[PDB]
Amino acid sequence: GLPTMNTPGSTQFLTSDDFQSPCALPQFDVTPSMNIPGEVKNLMEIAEVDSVVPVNNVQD
Amino acid sequence: GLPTMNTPGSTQFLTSDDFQSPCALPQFDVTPSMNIPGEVKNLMEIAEVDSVVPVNNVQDTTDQMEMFRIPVTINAPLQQQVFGLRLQPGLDSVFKHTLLGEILNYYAHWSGSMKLTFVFCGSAMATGKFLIAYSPPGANPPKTRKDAMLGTHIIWDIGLQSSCVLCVPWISQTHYRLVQQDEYTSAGYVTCWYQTGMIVPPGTPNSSSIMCFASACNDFSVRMLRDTPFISQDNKLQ
Amino acid sequence: TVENFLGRSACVYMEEYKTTDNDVNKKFVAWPINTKQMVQMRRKLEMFTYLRFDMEVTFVITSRQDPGTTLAQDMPVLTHQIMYVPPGGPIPAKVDDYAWQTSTNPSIFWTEGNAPARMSIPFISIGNAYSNFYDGWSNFDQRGSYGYNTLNNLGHIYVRHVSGSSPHPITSTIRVYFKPKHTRAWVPRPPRLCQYKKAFSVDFTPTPITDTRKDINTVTTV
Amino acid sequence: TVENFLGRSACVYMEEYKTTDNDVNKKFVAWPINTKQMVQMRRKLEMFTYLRFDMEVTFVITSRQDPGTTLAQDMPVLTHQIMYVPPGGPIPAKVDDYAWQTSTNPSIFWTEGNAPARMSIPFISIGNAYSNFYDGWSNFDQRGSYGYNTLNNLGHIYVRHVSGSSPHPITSTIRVYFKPKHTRAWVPRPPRLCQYKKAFSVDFTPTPITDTRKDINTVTTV
Amino acid sequence: TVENFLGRSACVYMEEYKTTDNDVNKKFVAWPINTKQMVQMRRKLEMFTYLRFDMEVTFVITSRQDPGTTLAQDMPVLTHQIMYVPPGGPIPAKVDDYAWQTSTNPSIFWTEGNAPARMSIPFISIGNAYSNFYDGWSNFDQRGSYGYNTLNNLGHIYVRHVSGSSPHPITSTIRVYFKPKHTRAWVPRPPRLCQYKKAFSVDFTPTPITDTRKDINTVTTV
Amino acid sequence: SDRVRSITLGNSTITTQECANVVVGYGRWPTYLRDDEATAEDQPTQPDVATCRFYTLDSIKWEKGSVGWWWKFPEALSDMGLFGQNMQYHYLGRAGYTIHVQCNASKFHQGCLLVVCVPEAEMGGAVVGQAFSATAMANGDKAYEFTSATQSDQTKVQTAIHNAGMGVGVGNLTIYPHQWINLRTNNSATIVMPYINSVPMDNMFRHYNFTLMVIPFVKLDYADTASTYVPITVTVAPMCAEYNGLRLAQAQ
C-alpha cells in the first residue's frame, strides 16, 4: 500500500463539512427538472422585500 | 479501494505539524481586512529596536529607576572604570529582560553583531572623553584601561552629538552561540573607562548619568524555537 | 444562497434497536422516510413551497452496553445493515428474514469504528419538484387524506445488526442526516410562527404575532 | 516572521465531561470561546494590539474509565459531538436536548481511535481586526464593562457524548488547540511581565523590573 | 556509501512510564537527547569525527497491563504526548503541569493502534558539524568538564499519557529511533575496540588487539 | 537652519527657534475617511478651520523632583471650543493631531523628557482586582501624574513610573511615536498622530484612542539661578476631524 499518515480531524463528523460520499441508490433516474416560478437563490432576496413593521406594539 | 500501507507517525499529534484540516464553519464570510499601521513580520524587527539596558543593576538598589543610570563624576581618578558587563544577551541580568533579551529567550541559538548606544545626560556645559571596549573571550577579563584598550574599542567625545555607538562584532569560533550561554560559547566583556575626565565649569552639578541602549544589527538572527523561562503558573487563572 | 442555506447536514430522524431482546420489534428499525419529524430542518425546507435537489445522506450509528447486574463479556466489533425499501417492496418482519438479501434494494453494510456511512440519492420525485405543502385531497371526491402527507411515498429505511446477538444486550442508536445539494426552490412562504404539533399535518395552536412592551414609545431595557 | 511565531497549535482550553452522572452539567461542556485562559498563547497574542488571521482548530479528546469497586463492562467505541453556537443561538441545557440537531450550527461528529478532529474558521470579527486590548467601556456613559472582555462575543463551543451512556462512568477530557494562519499583526507591545491573575482583565500584582545582583560590577557566577 | 551505512533507523533510547503510580516520576519520561547510550548506533557514528545530517525520528510506543490480583477493567484507547524542550525552556515537574501546553515547543499527540509517530529535524548544531569527540575542556582554565559531553546541549524529550489515569496501572514503553539522512562525514577513525563503560565518556578497560592461535603457522581449525 | 519651524492651522500659528524634526505617526499623515473604508452611511460634517486649529491646555511646572505626567485623548480636548461641541453632538468622530510640547530653559539648565503617544494605553489599577472610575485617568485637560512609589490608593491607577501604568518597561516606550526634549538642544517636540484604531470611526467619549506621556528621564537641574520651576505647555490641533450620527448633545 501507499504509505499514509492520519492527521488530527480524522474520523470526526463536522456538521458543516463538505465531502463526497457513496450514493445508496446507484443509477437512480432523477425526475426531470421543471421551471417553477419564484426561484430563490440568496436569503437576502427575501430580506430585500418590504414587510409591515408593528411600530405601535404598545402595552395596552 | 486503492491499496495503502500506514507508516510510523500515523495518528500522532506533533505540535509543530503543518497539515490541512476540515473547516467547522463552511463558507464563513471573513470580516474584510483593514490596513492597520505597524505590521510586524519577523520578531527580529523588534530585536532591532533599542531598549534601555539596566546596567546599574547593583545590590543596594533602593529606587528601581536607578538601574538605568550609569554614574559619572568630576575629579575621578585617572583611568578609572565606569562599568563592566559580560556579553550574554540572553542570560546575563543586565540584558535578559530588555527587548533583545526577551526575544532571545524564545530561542536557543543566536548569532550576529550588537549595537550598544551610550547617551550622555549631563548638562550642555560638561565635557569628557570615555574609552568603551569589547574584549573577545580569554581566560581573564580586563582589569585596567591599559588591558581594555588592546581590544575592539571606540573613544567617545562629548559634544553636540550626545550619543555614541559601540558596535560589538560577531567574533566566534562557531556560527551560533547558545542563549543559555556556557564557557564553550563564551562571548566576552564590554567595559568603559575615563579617557580624560568629566570636566565642569562653575555652577553645574558634580555628577551626571549615562544611559545604555541595546539592539541587534542586520547580521543578527536566532534559531531553535523554545519556551521562555520567564513566565509560569501553578494553577489555571480563575 | 439557497444552496448554502439548505446545504448543511441536519438530523432528520433517530431511533434505537437492540442487539438482543424478547420483543422482535425492539431489534430493528423501520422508518417511513420524511422530513417532518425534526423541527429545525422542517422549518427551513418549509420556507419554500417547492424544492428540487439531490440528497446526501450520512448515518451516525453508536452503541452502548445496557446496564445490568452481570456485564462481563467480550463482544467482537458490530456491523450494521441499512436497507432502503422503495414503495411496494417486501418489508422485513424480523432481523433474520429473507428480505434482508437485498438482491435489488440498495443496502449499506457498515462496521463500527469507521468513518460514518454516506451516499447520494438523486431527485427521485414522480413530480417535477418536491412539494412541502399540498392543499388538497387524495380522492377526486374531495375526501380521504388532506395535506402534504398524501404526496409522501418515498419508501422506508430498515436497519438491523448483522449477526450481532450478544450475551448481554447492547443498544445501538442510528441518527440520519440529510444535506440537500444542487438545489432549486420556488415560491417562498412566511416562516412557521407557531410551534409544530404533528409530524403529518400543518396543525397548530394560535400564537401571538410577537412579544409586547409597555407602550408604543418604550425604547429602554429597564 | 509573525506567521511563524504564531503558527503552532497551542492548547487554549480543556475540560471534562462524564458519560454518566447524576448531575446534568457534569455530562457536557459549554465553553465561551476566548484566548485568555491559557497563559502561553495569551502572552504571544498579547505582544500585538491588533491581529487578523484565519484559524485552524484541532481537538484532542481522550477517555478513561472512572475508578470504582466494580469495573467489568464491555463498552463499544465512543463518538463525540462538538457544536459551535454563534451568539444568540439556542443553547443546550442537557445532553439529550433538541438544540443538538444542528440544522444550521456547524458540528463535528468524531469517533475515538481516529486522527484528531480539525477544521478551519475564517477571520470572523465584526471589526477589521481582532483587538487584544480595549481601553474603554461598553456604555457611552463611560460605565458598564471595562476592557477587552467587552469585545468578546465569538460564541460558545458545546460538546457531548453522542449516545454514550455507560453502566459505569467514563470521563472524557477535551483539549482545544488554536493555530492562527494567514496572519497580520499591528502595533506591537511590551511582553507581559507580571503573572496573569484573571481570565477577563489585565489585572496584576506589581512585579520588579528584573532580578538583582550584589553590585553594579558583579560579573562572576560564584 | 555513508548515507547508506548510517541511513537505517536505530534504537537510541527506551524507558517506561506508568499510567498511574504513587511516585510522580514514574508517570512520565524526561530524556536528555544524546546518541551515546545505545551501543550499536554509537559505534557507527563514532567511526567519524564530525558528522552533518538531517534527522528522521520514529517512536515506537507499546502498553501492557500490569499484573495484579484484580485486572478487570475496560480502558478506552490511550493517547500520548511527546514534547521537545529546547535548552532553557520550562521543564515539566509532573504529568499535569502547565508546561505541557506547548504553545511554542514542538509536540506530537499520538493514539495507540496507529502507524508509529515520525518527523524530521534539520541539522541543528550551533557549530558547522556535530562532534562525536571533543579533546578539550569547558573552562578556558583547562578545567571543568572534559570530553564530548561538554558540547551536548540538544535539549530534552518529555513524554506522558494525555489523560490516561486508569483504575489499575498500565505501563507504556517508548522506544526512540534515529535515522540520519542527507549525511556528510569527516575524518574517519578506527572503530571502537573496547566495550563501552560510560554513556558520557570514552572510558574503557584495556582489551587485547585480537584473539590468539597456537603458533604463527597454525592454519587448520581442529 | 532647520531648527526654525512654523505651523499654521486655522487661525493659529506656532513657531519654534530651536527644534529637532517633526515626528509623523508611523510615517502616516492624517487623512479623511475614504468611501471604501466607511460603514456609517450619513453625510459627515468636516468643520474644517473651526475645529482643526491649535488649542493650548493648562500649563504645568517641571520641578527638580517631578516624575512624569499623562493626558488621554480625545478627552483632554472635550471642552475646547467647537471641537468639544462637535464631540458632544455626534455619536461618531475621527481625527488625527499635531501635538506641540513646549519647554524652554537656558544654556545652564539640564534635563531630558520623553514625549510619547501611546495608542490604547490601557492601565492597571492601584490594587489588582479593584476597579477604578474614569476620573482616575482623565478629566478635561487636567494633567495626571505618575509617582516614584507604588500606588496604594485603590481609587487610583497604578502610577509607579517605571512601569508606565501598563506593566511594561518604561525604557521601551520608544517603539511608539516619540521625540525627546533634551534641554541642551531642544525647546519643544512636535508629533503628528494619524487616526489609529481597529474600526473606521469611534465614539469620542467612550474610547481614549491614545495617551500623551511626558516623562523626565534625566531630572531637571540647575545652579544659582533665580528661576525655579520650568513650565511645560501642551498645544494640540485636531486634523481632518469628521463626525457622523448627529443627535442631542451628551450632557457631559
Q: Is the N-terminal amide bond of C116 cis, ω within 30° of 0?
A: no
- Roughly how many angstroms between the first and final C-alpha of chain B, as a whole number? 51
CB of C39 less than 8 A from some CB of D: yes
In a 3-state reduction of DSSP, which class is residue F242?
strand
Residue B15 has its nearest CB partner, among E90, E105, E126, at: E105
Contact check, Cβ <8 Å, F25/B65: no
Residues of D in contact with A14 (CB under 8 A): 82, 106-109, 117, 119
CB of D217 less than 8 A from some CB of C: no
Expressed in percent and rounded to 5, the helix, strand and coil fractions of chain A are 5, 5, 85
Residue carrying C-alpha cell 549631563: B122
H or E segment and range at residue C62? strand C48-65
Question: Which method resolved this structure?
Answer: cryo-EM
CB of E120 less than 8 A from some CB of B: no
Contact check, Cβ <8 Å, D78/E76: yes
Residue D216 has its nearest CB partner, among B42, B43, B83, at: B83
Contact check, Cβ <8 Å, A14/D59: no
CB of C125 less than 8 A from some CB of D: no
Task: For residue D84, give every residue at least 6 positions away whose Cβ sits within 8 Å of its Cβ, in sequence order, or none.
Answer: B24, B25, D105, D106, D107, D155, D156, D157, D158
Residues of C in contact with D113 (CB under 8 A): 113
Residue B30 has its nearest CB partner, among D123, D214, D216, at: D123
CATH topology of domain B1-238: Jelly Rolls (2.60.120)
Task: For residue B119, give every residue at least 6 positions away whose Cβ sits within 8 Å of its Cβ, in sequence order, or none.
Answer: B162, B163, B210, B211, B213
CB of D145 less than 8 A from some CB of E: no
D residues 29-88 near B, CB within 8 Å? 37-40, 43, 48, 50, 52, 54, 56-58, 60, 82, 84
Amino acid at residue number A20: Q
> Which chains reach chain B with 3 or more Cβ–Cβ distances below 8 angstroms?
A, D, E, F
Residue in B125, B51, B62 with CA at minimum distance from that of residue B94: B51
Residues of A in contact with E118 (CB under 8 A): 5
Residue carrying C-alpha cell 506621556: F213
Contact check, Cβ <8 Å, D129/F198: yes
Distance CA D171, CA D65 (A): 6
Pick the residue from chain B with its C-alpha nearest to A19: B22
Chains F and C in direct contact, meaning 3 or more beta-carbon pairs closer than 8 angstroms: no
Residue in B111, B90, B92, B102 with CA at minimum distance from that of residue B223: B111
F residues 29-68 near D, CB within 8 Å? none
- Structure resolution, Å: 9.5
β-partners of residue F37 are none
Chains D and A in direct contact, meaning 3 or more beta-carbon pairs closer than 8 angstroms: yes
Contact check, Cβ <8 Å, A8/E115: no
CA dihedral defined by F172, B109, B58, B77, rounded to 10 degrees? -100
Q: Which three cell numbers stand for residue E141?
A: 582554565
| Strand pairing report for B70-73 and E130-131 | unpaired
Cα F45 to chain center, whole Å? 24
**Chain D: nearest CA to F120, how far in angstroms?**
6
Residues of A in contact with E56 (CB under 8 A): none
Q: Which ranges constitute the DSSP H helices of chain C?
A: 2-6, 39-45
Q: Which three cell numbers stand for residue C111?
A: 462496521
Distance CA D107, CA D82 (A): 5
Burial E48-72 (b: 16+ CB within 10 A, else e): bbbbbbebbbbbebebeeeeeeeee
**Chain D: nearest CA to E202, how far in angstroms?**
30
Distance CA F107, CA F110 (A): 8
Distance CA C98, CA F229 (A): 106
Residue in D32, D55, D48, D38 with CA at minimum distance from that of residue D131: D48
Q: Which ranges constitute the DSSP H helices of E37-164?
A: 39-45
Q: What angle do CA D171, C12, C187 make, to 5 degrees?
A: 140
Cα D212 to chain center, whole Å? 36
Contact check, Cβ <8 Å, C8/A33: no
**Chain A: nearest CA to C183, how far in angstroms?**
9
Cα B216 to chain center, whole Å? 7
Residue C71 has its nearest CB partner, among D102, D111, D167, at: D167
Residue F172 has its nearest CB partner, among D135, D190, D204, at: D190
Distance CA E33, CA E155 (A): 6
| Strand pairing report for A2-4 and B4-6 | parallel
Task: For residue C67, give every residue at least 6 positions away whose Cβ sits within 8 Å of its Cβ, in sequence order, or none.
Answer: D167
Amino acid at residue number F180: W
Distance CA F169, CA F165 (A): 10
Q: Which three cell numbers stand for residue D111?
A: 469517533
CB of E212 less than 8 A from some CB of B: no
C-alpha distance from residue F157 to each of C43, C94, F57 (Å) = 54, 77, 22
Backbone interruptions in chain E following residues (C to N > 2.5 Å): none
Distance CA C134, CA C36 (A): 14
Q: For residues B132 and B212, is the Cβ–Cβ distance under 8 A?
A: no
Contact check, Cβ <8 Å, D212/B61: yes
β-partners of residue D159 are D29, D82
Cα E178 to chain center, whole Å? 8
Maximum Cα–Cα distance across chain E = 71
Test mutation, B226, B228, B230, B232, chain E, max E CBs within 10 A:
B226
Residues of E in contact with A11 (CB under 8 A): none
In a 3-state reduction of DSSP, which class is residue F179?
strand
In a 3-state reduction of DSSP, which class is residue D218?
coil
Distance CA B103, CA F68 (A): 29
CB of E186 less than 8 A from some CB of A: no
Distance CA D180, CA D164 (A): 33
Task: For residue C25, give every residue at least 6 positions away whose Cβ sits within 8 Å of its Cβ, in sequence order, or none.
Answer: none
* Gyration radius of chain E's alpha carbons: 21
In a 3-state reduction of DSSP, which class is residue D26?
helix
Distance CA C13, CA D215 (A): 77
Contact check, Cβ <8 Å, B203/F28: no
Q: For residues D144 and D150, is the Cβ–Cβ distance under 8 A?
A: yes
CB atoms within 10 A of CB E198: 12
Residue in B118, B124, B125, B129 with CA at minimum distance from that of residue B210: B118
Q: Is D195 exposed, middle or buried (0-12, 13-18, 19+ CB in 10 A)?
A: middle
Distance CA E178, CA E157 (A): 13
D80 φ, ψ to 5°? Answer: -115, 155
Residues of C in contact with A33 (CB under 8 A): 52, 123, 128, 184
C-alpha distance from residue E108 to each of D205, E63, E102 (Å) = 35, 18, 10
Residue E109 has its nearest CB partner, among D41, D60, D75, at: D60
Residues in chain B: 238
Test mutation, D109, D161, D174, chain A, max A CBs within 10 A:
D109
Q: For residues F117 and F210, is the Cβ–Cβ distance under 8 A?
A: yes
CB of F251 less than 8 A from some CB of D: no
Contact check, Cβ <8 Å, B8/E117: yes
Task: Bin F68: left if φ > 0, else alpha if -120 < ψ < 50, else beta.
Answer: left
DSSP state of D151: G
Q: For residues F124 and F165, is the Cβ–Cβ distance under 8 A?
A: yes
| Strand pairing report for E170-188 and E10-18 | antiparallel
Distance CA F200, CA F178 (A): 24
CB of E209 less than 8 A from some CB of A: no
Distance CA B56, CA B8 (A): 55
Pick the residue from chain D with its C-alpha nearest to A5: D115
Q: For residues D219 and B83, is the Cβ–Cβ distance under 8 A?
A: no
**Chain B: nearest CA to E93, how far in angstroms?**
11
Residues of B in contact with F224 (CB under 8 A): 203
Distance CA B92, CA B190 (A): 13
C-alpha distance from residue C17 to each of C64, E122, F138 (Å) = 11, 54, 69
Task: For residue F29, give every residue at least 6 positions away whose Cβ sits within 8 Å of its Cβ, in sequence order, or none.
Answer: F96, F192, F194
| Strand pairing report for D79-85 and E10-18 | unpaired
Q: What angle do CA A52, A57, A59 make, to 5 degrees?
A: 165
Task: For residue C222, give every residue at least 6 positions away whose Cβ sits within 8 Å of its Cβ, in sequence order, or none.
Answer: none
Contact check, Cβ <8 Å, D186/B46: no
| Strand pairing report for F188-193 and F23-24 | parallel
Residues of E in contact with D44 (CB under 8 A): 103-104
Contact check, Cβ <8 Å, A2/B4: yes
**Chain B: nearest CA to A22, how far in angstroms?**
13
In SS3 terms, F185-229 reads as CCCEEEEEECCCCCCCCECCCCECCEEEEEEEEEEEECCCCCCCC
CB of F134 less than 8 A from some CB of D: yes
Q: For residues F241 and F86, is the Cβ–Cβ distance under 8 A?
A: yes
| Strands in chain D per DSSP E | 10-18, 28-32, 48-65, 79-85, 107-111, 118-121, 130-131, 156-161, 170-188
Task: Bin B135: left if φ > 0, else alpha if -120 < ψ < 50, else beta.
Answer: beta
| Strand pairing report for D156-161 and E118-121 | unpaired
C-alpha distance from residue B173 to each of B170, B189, D10 (Å) = 10, 16, 37
Residues of B in contact with E141 (CB under 8 A): 139
Q: What angle do CA C188, C192, C193 make, to 5 degrees?
A: 135
Amino acid at residue number D93: A
Residue B25 has its nearest CB partner, among D2, D37, D106, at: D106
Contact check, Cβ <8 Å, B25/D84: yes
User: HSE on the CB side for A13, CA within 13 Å?
Assistant: 31
- Roughly how many angstroms between the first and final C-alpha of chain A, as a whole number? 76
